[PDB]
Write a protein that binds this ligand. Structure first.
Ligand code: FAD
Ligand code: FAD
Ligand code: GP7
Ligand code: GP7
Lengths: 425, 425
């Protein structure tokens, strides 16, 4: 008999189980994998021996994320300022200049006018409310259709389409404008603040903060896949893959949105929620770490190819480096090494590919998707309630975060609300 | 006894008299000066013999001003492109960059936020309604207080404050924020569109378009300053200072706004209009053509000096050159030759000043004004009423324009309205 059972051992699960234990509650953590952290995946490189690489994500903003900075200050995890870019090799047409802002002086008027349209539509969205309660049905259309409404000149059009396919991790025909404007609204109402918010990085990786949080949790059961949560009786029963089952008064679900459908809930989750969970969000984001030779430090290649963004990651040696590429799993196939070469040679012909390192998050049964990006029409119907508790069962994660979706801060912010509901209720 | 008498030989007055005569009406032109065109002053330079310069203004845009191009396509008068800028000498701080857009990348996020607030408030103005009846009283406050509300970084602030001093011809503490937003609203809701509307210019000066329009008007009287209008009887009486008087069914007043105090109206103008007319607008714009040597080919200087804008005008020779400086009559003394030497020294210390050429429109009794720029409060109280007919007396010009004020287009647009009102009424 536990006070709370936390399903999942990610940043939401590691914080929720820890904070409840400190109050005096008997907490059990159930992780279905062989490791804790989740999408904060920090391992040794498959390409280079003795090179610690971030498969998930490290980048962060100190003033943007106070809770994340509070955890760094608590355990003493140091953060250094993020690397800047010096070299630029874009493929945004012949009239584009190769620098930080590739937009020519001819487009300046139209970009200025489009900035207003993008900001105004984003300023409509309130972060404290939901994407369902603000009459934002007119903004939930395919991204490519919404981008054409701006009628952007060649360079500004493709530059915005490249970063959107980076950030959302889904092509313009699949991506929703509402979620694109949500990401603007989430980043202090700023279209530039989506990219320029990469202020500081994890110096030792996410692994240091993951292990430090796990140290203050007394009971963790690894390789324990939860297949169902049942709150029939007076207490909530949690059943597991391997037969067994656990029981607790309250239950924390700290698993990604695309994995909730694999869990049988009794009684079933509210009708508003049901249908979107079964089909899942259209997050197909793909991150490949290319091991290269003949590449300089601080290159940024934002163009129009199958790799919309290809830029510098870290130094391997004197000549060898790592380039990080962003695309989607549906469009690009990472298993074709010839397709990798053709994508890199599109931006840098002199640079040769030595190897690749990635993780297929959409293929993994414990995630079925990387970070949150809804399909056209999903979050207009239900969004706020997806992270709102149903009985004794709480739903947390970066997928349900209203303030910072798809960020480590969002994982800690949502889990904090779940702990507050149990202790003060 | 005429069908209509147009008072003023400016672009508004010439168009009003011409279009009515072409319609088949008996029209009389009355100009108090020794020349036609008005603020369209294009004559020989005082410093350089033979060289023809624009004392008033020639900077037009075929896209922003479609009616000005309609006259240029009518008479076949050609126009040449803008004097592009290559050299940049800015005084916006060490953080600024010496380019066309001097705002650094450190302020890129700050401009983004300030652009929205400036555009949103500009979009709040409907051009057709008028500034007096749109509830914009909160925007009709001193410019220095408005710019402080946005809270701008050193460069982005002073770059906006310098161009505002030029475009309005008023210092920040005297200029109205509503009028600054009006210029943006008139320029297709664009801050960059205000500056990037120095597009094409008159190849032979404004005199080409002035003399072409005047030769289609039969009855023109030069050196006839109108002292009053009387519409009390069956027909409207127009009294002159010499050669008094004249008679017509309709009367058009195309004289500058600040001269309407001198003309006595019977019956007196509506109570709404008497408040602003009898004090006039606070526009003090001072354009100074400075003859120099040792100056670069295509300089642009924007800073925090008494000359907010000092840029390249035209090539005098391979050594000697003509520059143009914008300021106001109150803050700067154009008679003081030593003050011009010091003001140019602030931006270009290696440049010798030889002579100056200007014309004070403030001191001129025929103008009492340069181009229109209202005082704080004036245009939120009464605006469109000033350009509306006072019975049989029609009011036109660029001063009372809503579509494009302070431009030759405004004189062109208003003249079309008054002619259509008399011909159809
Ligand atoms: C490519 C990429 C780039 C990123 N970049 C950034 C960035 O720049 N900045 C930033 O702040 N964040 C970034 N992140 C996002 C961040 O890594 C995640 O949002 C964060 O790890 C979410 O933590 P969580 O605990 O809420 O969910 P998760 O970390 O996904 O935790 C879920 C855990 O539950 C387990 N689980 C799933 N199903 C079951 C089950 N049925 N039974 C038991 N356990 C189960 C999973 O194994 C997993 O360990 C990035 C992520 C990716 C993938
Ligand atoms: C320094 C400067 C720069 C400019 N730059 C530009 C520019 O770059 N682009 C642009 O589009 N526009 C520019 N203009 C603005 C434009 O020239 C004017 O605002 C306006 O178009 C002038 O035409 P108007 O017919 O409205 O007035 P006016 O041309 O002044 O017409 C009124 C005429 O009536 C006469 N008059 C006055 N009183 C009497 C009376 N009592 N009886 C009889 N006649 C009288 C006056 O002598 C005057 O000639 C500039 C103006 C100035 C001063
Ligand atoms: C009331 C008056 C208000 C003052 C208005 C200030 C506007 C400044 C106009 C100066 C810009 C003219 C050209 C700019 C680009 C340029 O020429 O030179 C360009 C450099 O500029 C660019 O191409 C990128 C700029 C994109 C910015 C888009 C949004 C701008 C924000 C609006 C401005 C806000 C200012 C205050 C908040 C390069 O080479 P070109 O000339 O061959 O291309
Ligand atoms: C969901 C998708 C969101 C996509 C957002 C795409 C934005 C990515 C921008 C990344 C580049 C940042 C440029 C910052 C400046 C810089 O460092 O590069 C500078 C040049 O840039 C500038 O001078 C700043 C110009 C000011 C523009 C402000 C207006 C906002 C524009 C809105 C953008 C609209 C996008 C198109 C619709 C190089 O000289 P510097 O380093 O010496 O100075």
């Amino acid at each position: 008999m536990y006070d709370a059972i936390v399903v999942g051992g990610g940043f939401s699960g590691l914080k929720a189980a820890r904070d409840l234990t400190n109050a005096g509650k008997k907490v059990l953590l159930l992780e279905g994998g062989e490791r804790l952290g989740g999408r904060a995946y920090s391992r040794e490189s498959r390409n280079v021996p003795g090179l610690r690489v971030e498969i998930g994500g490290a980048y962060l903003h100190r003033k943007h994320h106070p809770r994340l900075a509070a955890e760094l200050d608590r355990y003493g995890i140091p953060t250094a300022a993020a690397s800047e870019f010096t070299s630029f090799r874009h493929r945004l047409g012949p009239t584009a200049v190769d620098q930080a802002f590739p937009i020519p002086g001819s487009e300046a008027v139209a970009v200025e006018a489009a900035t207003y349209t993008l900001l105004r539509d984003a300023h409509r969205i309130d972060l404290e409310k939901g994407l369902e309660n603000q009459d934002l049905e007119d903004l939930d259309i395919p991204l490519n259709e919404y981008v054409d409404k701006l009628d952007l000149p060649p360079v500004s059009r493709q530059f915005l389409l490249a970063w959107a396919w980076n950030m959302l991790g889904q092509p313009a025909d699949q991506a929703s404008a509402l979620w694109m404007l949500q990401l603007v609204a989430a980043h202090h109402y700023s279209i530039l603040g989506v990219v320029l918010s990469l202020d500081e990085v994890f110096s030792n990786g996410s692994a240091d903060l993951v292990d430090a949080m796990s140290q203050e949790i007394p009971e963790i059961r690894l390789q324990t896949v939860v297949t169902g949560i049942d709150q029939s009786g007076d207490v909530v029963n949690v059943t597991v893959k391997d037969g067994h089952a656990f029981q607790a008064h309250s239950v924390i679900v700290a698993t990604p949105m695309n994995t909730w459908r694999r869990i049988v809930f009794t009684p079933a989750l509210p009708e508003r929620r049901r249908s979107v969970i079964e089909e899942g969000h259209g997050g197909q984001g793909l991150k490949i770490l290319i091991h290269v030779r003949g590449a300089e430090a601080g290159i940024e290649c934002v163009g129009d190819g199958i790799f919309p963004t290809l830029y510098d990651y870290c130094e391997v040696s004197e000549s060898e480096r790592l380039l990080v590429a962003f695309t989607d799993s549906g469009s690009f196939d990472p298993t074709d090494i010839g397709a990798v070469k053709d994508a890199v040679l599109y931006y840098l012909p002199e640079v040769e590919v030595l190897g690749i390192d990635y993780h297929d998050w959409i293929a993994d049964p414990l995630f079925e998707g990387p970070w949150v990006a809804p399909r056209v029409g999903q979050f207009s119907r239900v969004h706020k309630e997806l992270g709102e508790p149903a009985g004794r069962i709480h739903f947390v994660g970066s997928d349900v975060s209203l303030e910072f979706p798809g960020y480590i801060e969002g994982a800690l912010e949502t889990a904090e609300c779940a702990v507050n509901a149990i202790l003060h209720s």
